[PDB]
Amino acid sequence: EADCGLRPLFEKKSLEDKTERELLESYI
Amino acid sequence: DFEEIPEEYLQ
Amino acid sequence: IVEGSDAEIGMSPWQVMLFRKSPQELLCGASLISDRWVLTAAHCLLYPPWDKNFTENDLLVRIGKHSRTRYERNIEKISMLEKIYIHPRYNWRENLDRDIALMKLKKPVAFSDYIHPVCLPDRETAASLLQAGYKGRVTGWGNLKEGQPSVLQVVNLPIVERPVCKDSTRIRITDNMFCAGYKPDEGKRGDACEGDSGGPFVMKSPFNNRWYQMGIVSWGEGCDRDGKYGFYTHVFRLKKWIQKVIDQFG
Ligand SMILES: N=C(N)N1CCC(CNC(=O)[C@@H]2CCCN2C(=O)[C@H](N)Cc2ccccc2)CC1
Ligand SMILES: *[C@@H]1O[C@H](CO)[C@@H](O)[C@H](O)[C@H]1NC(C)=O
Ligand code: NA
Ligand code: NA
Description:
The structure holds three protein chains of three kinds. Helix content of chain A is 25%, strand content 0%. Chain A is built from one helix and no strands. The termini of chain A are far apart. Chain C has a domain at 15-117 and 239-247: Trypsin-like serine proteases (Thrombin, subunit H). Chain C has helices at 123-129, 162-167, 239-249; strands spanning 5-6, 15-20, 25-32, 37-40, 46-47, 52-53, 59-63, 77-86, 101-105, 135-140, 153-158, 177-180, 200-204, 211-219, 230-234. A seven-stranded antiparallel sheet of chain C has the order 1-11-10-13-14-15-12. Chain C has a six-stranded antiparallel beta barrel with strand order 2-3-4-9-8-7. Chain C has a two-stranded antiparallel sheet with strand order 5-6. In chain C, a hairpin with a 4-residue loop joins strand 2 and strand 3. The longest helix of chain C has 11 residues, at 239-249. Chain C is globular, with a radius of gyration of 17 Å. The A-C interface holds A 1, 3-11, 17-20, 22-24, 26-28 and C 5, 8-11, 13, 33-34, 112-114, 116-120, 129, 133-137, 154, 156, 158, 203-206, 209-212. The structure holds the ligand N=C(N)N1CCC(CNC(=O)[C@@H]2CCCN2C(=O)[C@H](N)Cc2ccccc2)CC1, 2-acetamido-2-deoxy-beta-D-glucopyranose and sodium ion (2 copies).
């Protein structure tokens, strides 16, 4: 749980998935 | 539709 | 999931499938919160109106999956249940208030590229992120319309203002719920559907880049109907119960 919420194939290797930018853009 | 899973789990 | 898309490999490594032994079939979604604990919706396990009252040995959980129906050799892990814990004030008689349950696994699951727990929110992350217009992400293998998908589906959906949620339904909504989805004529759609229950509504924190599970797929009227919205169990509001169960059973 110290490492919770960080995905091996994405955050752990600083890659983004195809639609997570849509989430970030909604947080105004 | 569901592929059968190993019997080890179903026991 | 209605009007979603195929998930990428490893996009949701906390996603869990609840699987019935006999006959072998998907029951529900669920989520991995540690190597021994799995979160789901209570109505996935107990719903007397549908003659649903599962016991531990009725069930398996399948972790790390992508395909809905294939046995994903060397990728997925299949775990047996030690114990099911349903919220003591789960209201199956009326409106699914407190639609939440924990499942403790018999043995810890090994993490991998495909298997990894999601975070649970604290009060500060909940207050920051659970705001109308902010988008979260829902995942599942449920129905594609009100047939069924080959692989895990994903859809991003905005949280809806509470008065709009209330005015969309005759069912009594509580502080232990929130709703999400697009308003009509907004130009976009999408919803959870039957079979997606118990799966997670997640948000990616812009402060620390971690994914947090804010909700559990709970209920709705139809799927992807205009003027209707999907309802989700409010995970933070029930966090004290979650912690009590974990801090007294393992
Ligand atoms: N569009 C969606 N996002 N959802 C997603 C979740 C699915 C599956 N969940 C159900 O079928 C639940 C289980 C019990 C009945 N129920 C309902 O949703 C009823 N229609 C309304 C209701 C009845 C009693 C109490 C509370 C609500 C439904 C569609
Ligand atoms: C469901 O089954 C469990 C164990 O079989 C029992 O303890 C519980 O009272 C039952 N509840 C309902 C509503 O059937
Ligand atoms: Na209303
Ligand atoms: Na709608």
